[PDB]
Design a protein around this ligand. Structure first.
Ligand SMILES: CCCCC/C=C\C/C=C\CCCCCCCC(=O)O
Ligand SMILES: [Co+2]
Length: 121
């Protein structure tokens, strides 16, 4: 694993939009950090996390990878504790739902951590 840069993420966005044929109105929403509760959006988030090596469709969230991605300027073990709170089983047998659910969980108390991780260092 190697941490994804801002440039890496910008590429992964356009790749997922192209590969999944995401409509233009969704792209606009994503830009404004608006993620509708629908399968279009959930599969998009899964696609991005796949490319960033933060999520595997079978194994689920890749915890150590997430910690490295998120713990810049923070305590790694504190961040690991927060990540693990959001790690769950693939209850409803849907990788798209699964990836999105962890995303939603982590945003609740760690939004600024997410946003900080995707800005140029
Ligand atoms: C256990 C679950 C953990 C979930 C952690 C959440 C986020 C992962 C960390 C960094 C990746 C940034 C997400 C980019 C958002 C995609 C939408 C977009 O900007 O186009
Ligand atoms: Co950083």
């Amino acid at each position: 694993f190697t941490v994804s840069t801002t440039e890496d993420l910008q590429r992964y966005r356009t790749e997922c939009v192209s590969s999944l044929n995401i409509p233009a109105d969704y792209v606009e929403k994503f830009k404004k950090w608006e993620f509708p509760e629908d399968d279009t959006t959930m599969c998009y988030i899964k696609c991005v996390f796949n490319k960033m090596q933060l999520f595997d469709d079978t194994e689920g969230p890749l915890v150590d990878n997430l910690v490295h991605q998120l713990a810049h300027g923070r305590d790694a073990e504190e961040v690991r504790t927060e990540v693990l709170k959001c790690v769950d089983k693939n209850t409803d047998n849907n990788a798209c739902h699964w990836a999105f659910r962890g995303f939603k969980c982590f945003q609740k108390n760690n939004l600024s951590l997410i946003k900080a991780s995707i800005k140029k260092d």
